[PDB]
């Protein structure tokens, strides 16, 4: 927006400076890990946990915190939901999209995400695994989605998982997959104990961006 081009412009015009001595690192502090509060808060690299009234020299970011969004199927106890889960890496500035995929694959802790091969895409357009972030103008503000193999097959009832509400889960598939790990047959402590949302939550029509009545 405004900030992005204001700051970009500032950087560009600061690099074209003929006469500059350079900063004095005695006067340019880092950040603290020691501050009041229980929680550990991670901030921007231009921001600090103390009050610094003076504006620091624009620096170029050598690690860009990319976000990569996946579709996930959550078990909500009335059936399946499809919602969004982000992975966040720190990708070196000049890195190749191939290498970004690799970073992503190493940084997800959910067993339900990276199972098959996937392609990174911005606004639906696939990206070259061959080229740099520099060419595609990826600023960390950019919206980057992630498209799996079977994802265009989801409109069917096959690839989309089958919930024990409406479908048989058989001795075939009780020993395999999320179905196994879930423990459908109720135990005393009630099993993994997932989140539940009831049937009448959204009314008769499910959640939409457009008001349907």
């Amino acid at each position: 927006g405004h900030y992005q081009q204001e700051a970009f412009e500032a950087r560009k015009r600061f690099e074209e400076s003929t006469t500059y001595p350079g900063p004095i690192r005695a006067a340019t502090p880092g950040d603290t890990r020691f501050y009041s509060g229980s929680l550990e808060s991670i901030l921007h690299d231009t921001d600090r946990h103390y009050w610094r009234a003076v504006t620091d020299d624009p620096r170029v970011q050598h690690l860009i915190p990319l976000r990569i969004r996946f579709k996930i199927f959550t078990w909500v106890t009335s059936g399946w939901e499809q919602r969004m889960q982000v992975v966040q890496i720190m990708a070196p500035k000049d890195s190749t999209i191939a290498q970004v995929k690799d970073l992503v694959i190493v940084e997800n802790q959910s067993p339900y995400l990276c199972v098959s091969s996937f392609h990174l895409a911005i606004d639906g357009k696939e990206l070259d695994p061959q080229k740099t972030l520099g060419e595609y103008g990826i600023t960390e503000q950019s919206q980057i989605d992630a498209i799996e193999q079977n994802d265009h097959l989801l409109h069917r009832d096959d690839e989309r998982p089958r919930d024990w509400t409406v479908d048989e889960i058989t001795a075939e598939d009780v020993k395999r997959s999320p179905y196994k790990e879930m423990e459908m047959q109720p135990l005393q402590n009630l099993a993994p104990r997932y989140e539940a949302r009831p049937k009448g939550y959204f009314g008769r029509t499910y959640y939409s961006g457009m008001k349907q009545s």
Binding site: E81, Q109, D123, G124, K125, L127, D151, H152, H155, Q212
Partner: protein
């Protein structure tokens, strides 16, 4: 209610209370529900001022390789009826789905046909909408649609490529909401028109010997009502408006 600051409550990995991500399914009617009122705005824009990638010629051709890094998001208008290379054809005859093109068909070009096209690999999509006849909107000379024969051979088509089962974002229609005026009502007073001398001004309000005919006497409703719509926070019709003004509800 406002959205809260951060989630410190539940582990992130499990993600817990999350509004479901909305996905647009091309098999169903709902698809069109999203895409249609966009199209109309789009066409309206095309009727007034030029937009670059809207009008094009002789379809498009790309390799199998670069197919998905080029196509998705693409929207363009062609003169004739020719269906894209390598697409299985699905006719949309189902009435419900059709229904959403109502506004676009009555107050813009009449819709002759709708077509859902799916490729060999099934991973792409094309929404193909064939209009018949001239627009019911006026078209300007310097506008994009003025470069087309189908308007102003009376059939022409709109082609929209997209990926299936994606959120109603990455079909890109919102870049088109640029608003340009229809200059038709003022074209009458331009130096170009010869009916500009048949115009005569009303500078002064005419002398009034009458009052407005009093409205029909009020019949108080006979049935049972749900109570004050004010206190129930119902907008005046349950339709539109502010809950402070209770006009037009039962009283």
């Amino acid at each position: 209610s406002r959205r809260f600051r951060y989630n410190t409550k539940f582990p992130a990995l499990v993600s817990y209370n999350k509004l479901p991500w909305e996905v647009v399914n091309h098999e169903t009617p709902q698809f069109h529900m999203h895409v249609a009122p966009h199209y109309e705005q789009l066409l309206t824009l095309a009727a007034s001022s030029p937009v670059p990638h809207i009008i094009g010629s002789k379809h498009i051709d790309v390799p199998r390789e670069h197919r998905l890094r080029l196509l998705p998001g693409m929207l363009y208008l062609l003169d004739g009826d020719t269906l894209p290379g390598e697409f299985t054809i699905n006719r949309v005859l189902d009435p419900t789905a059709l229904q959403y093109y109502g506004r676009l068909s009555s107050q813009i070009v009449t819709v002759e046909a709708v077509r859902m096209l799916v490729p060999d690999d099934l991973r792409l999509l094309c929404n193909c909408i064939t209009f018949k006849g001239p627009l019911h909107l006026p078209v300007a000379p310097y506008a994009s649609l003025a470069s087309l024969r189908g308007a102003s051979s009376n059939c022409f088509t709109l082609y929209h490529f997209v990926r299936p089962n994606r959120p109603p974002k990455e079909l890109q229609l919102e870049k088109y909401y640029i608003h340009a005026p229809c200059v038709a009502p003022l074209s009458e007073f331009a130096s170009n028109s010869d009916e500009r001398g048949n115009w005569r001004p009303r500078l002064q309000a005419p002398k009034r010997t009458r009052r407005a005919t009093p409205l029909p006497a009020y019949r108080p409703p006979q049935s049972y009502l749900m109570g004050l719509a004010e206190r129930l926070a119902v907008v005046p019709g349950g339709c539109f408006g502010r809950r402070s003004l209770m006009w037009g509800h039962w009283f």
